[model samples]
Target: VSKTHSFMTVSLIELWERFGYYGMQALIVYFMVQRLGFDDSRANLVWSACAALIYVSPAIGGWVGDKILGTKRTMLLGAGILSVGYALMTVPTENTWFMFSALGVIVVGNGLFKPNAGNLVRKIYESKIDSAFTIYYMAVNVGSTFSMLLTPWIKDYVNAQYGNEFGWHAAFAVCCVGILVGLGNYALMHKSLANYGSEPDTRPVNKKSLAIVLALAALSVVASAIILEYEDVARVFVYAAGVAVLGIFFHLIRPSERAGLIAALILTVQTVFFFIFYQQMSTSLALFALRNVDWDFQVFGTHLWTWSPAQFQALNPIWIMVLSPVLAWIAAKFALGFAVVAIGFFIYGFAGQFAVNGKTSSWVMIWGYASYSLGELLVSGLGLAMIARYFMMGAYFVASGISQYLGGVVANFASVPQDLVDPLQTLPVYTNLFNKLGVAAVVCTIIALAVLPLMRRLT
Candidate 1:
């Protein structure tokens, strides 16, 4: 394969992986609550925890791949595990434990797969990282955009055909198919990665060290699982455990190296902000779409049937795909300016707030989604490009995983009060809290922008 073909193949694989992951995710909460008799709060908690774990595992997976297993082996192992997880979901089981277990497998699989894939992409473009990343990111959007648009429509169709419970089954089937296709693609391209896959400049994984790492990981999982059974203490314990594990890992490494330490610190900060940003998927955006947005688009003689709230989730990826090149071109033509991007974030915050305040109007919520998508294009896509350009390649995966985990942690905290209350009535309360949080984010951004002039000089 030519160098360009190698890059395209990797990007295509990622696109399929994301399609499977997000398609399943889009239906997870709905399936749990509506079909499996889970309360909204319980379902949200389970989803948040699982999602957080999935994102956090990449750090461990990356560490293992760099130190011991090469990227190809890691990716194959992850793919196999992911296939099993999705296959298990195909069984018609109503038990919450079964669902949790299945989710755990997928999470672990993702941890293994996600980081390695990104690393491989970077390896392919060791020469021109930024342009390569931009191309790869386009593939991500292609997968995400199509899945986001189609998944909900499929869910609705399945629900109409076989009731709400079976809709999830169909969704799970789709997920399984996506994973299998992705695995096939990976296997086909495995030989091409021979030169690209190499262990990082790290010490070999000794047997004793491997055993200790496994023990610690097992302990952390058990501790987290037990703590999660309790209400008040779960969040605190989980976060503390995450910190403690990282601390232990750092202690094992040489004490003098500052690069890893700085990376971790920046990751922590970025994760915290991302925790809030990622909520646009389910909480603030979902609620606004459901409660306030109208979904009355017409096609031919038939109405394009869809839930408004679900449609908002589609906007981020759509905007990312459509506007990414335009933004990149603009950034290329005009140098990077914080003011322009900050304004984009401000518009996003305002759009979210506007949706919260408005009544059920399809156009209003659609506009809000459009604005939020624009914000994502400006902030997340651009921010990641900047990170890939300036920072070490490995930092991108670690930082992305950390940001996802951070969002998961914050989402868990934000959902607690809602869980304690009556779901049918208090759903609105939970949503309101999310909107207020968005407003607060906007205010904080403004404050930071005001201080940027002074901070710029110190740097």
Candidate 2:
């Protein structure tokens, strides 16, 4: 297999996959609040549930791809499922049951695609696995940033021609097209990757494992379906599950590797905590801008243009696009993963601060996002690789997925329903959350530094 073709192809597929995924993701909250008429709590629950499951379902894919089926087949299955979900989301109107089910379907598809995309990368880039994954992650942000940036434009543009309902439908339809584009691109490019990850395991255990994957897929849908309603209960169950995972990690890993495993767990949890602050980009911060921030833009010094809240989401990845190469270069020599992540948390805390510090200080948000982007360069994007360093494959995936789930759970605190009559009513809710997140970030930064020596050994 040609590594270059395989890398570009898989990365592009992932790019469009995220294009579809985050495009709709950017609009989901606004869609819920404005179109679907779901109240704040439910909308967020659904949002968080989908976000969590996107990670959770990946475990199933990783299991199936590596052990039972193969990465290529699993990826195709995922993309197909994803297309169905995005297409379903375009049916418009207020179909709560359908919307919930669409979200679940998308999660299942993402589960299959996300992990194996990385697996395919590894097969071709054994020598430069680190660099390849880093670049692919930036490719992910390209999809994320572009979708977050463009869909609002799409929605607004369509609304201008027809109606809001028609516009929303168009936006979701764009997402469907995005995934189909990815799927098509992969089909065109698969010849290069065919010999790499296409082998199937006919082992007797694969049959049992295949059954488990099916069971988990069913459970994932059911679990995600009601995660919003039973969030508190879900939190408890997740913690209980974490205990069992940790028990298994200790039960399975070697004595010599235990310290590395412990450090990896610490950093994984650290990244998850930081994601709580980051996910606000989709949830709390989106609403804050929608409800509080002035969207007016003055070129040089005149009120030249007005922008949508979704437009601002572009800042995070634009900064990343500009900064990633530099960070990737630096990441090459950076030995202590903990330090990088802790500093990322420290910077992320401030990103929130600068974002809501003033009523209309839009420039402050540049600093906020730039800081957050730099942190992303150092931290959250590095999470999966860090997990692979210490844990077995199963343990690595569970830790990663739980972190995504944990992100949703914690971000719920940042949710402040936009009070239409009094827009500023929930500003305090946002402000308070940003400040607290900042403090927690500082605490994590301190802890990571305190343990840098040990973490460096693992690196």
- Per-residue lDDT of candidate 2, residues 1-459 (tens digit): 567778899899999998998888778888888776776666665576567667667776776777666678778878888898888889875767777777777888888888787788887776488778778888998898889888889998998888677788789999999999988898887776545654463222356666777677667766665564466765665677678678776676546676677766665566556565566666766666666566776565788578787777778788988986675462221224334433443443343445453445455445556666666556544546655655354665556556655656565775654454354455556556656666666667666675567766766
Tens digits of per-residue lDDT for model 1 on 334-449? 11222333343344335444433243345544544555556555544334433232133344444444444345444444343324433344334444555555555555455444
Displacement of residue 86 (Cα, Å) in model 2 is 0.4
Tell me how far the alpha carbon of residue 87 in candidate 2 is from the true structure, in angstroms, after superposition: 0.8
Cα lDDT computed for each candidate against the true fold:
0.59, 0.69
The local distance difference test score of model 2 is 0.69
Query: Which parts of model 2 have CA positions greater than 4 angstroms off?
Result: 192-196, 201-223, 228-239, 246-265, 328-359, 380-396, 417-420, 456-459
> Which one wins on TM-score?
2
Question: Number of clashes in every candidate structure?
Answer: 1, 0
Total clashes for model 1: 1
Error of 2 at 155 (Å): 1.5
Give the best candidate by lDDT: 2
Model 2: weakest 10-residue lDDT segment is 330-339
Model 1 CA lDDT for position 211: 68
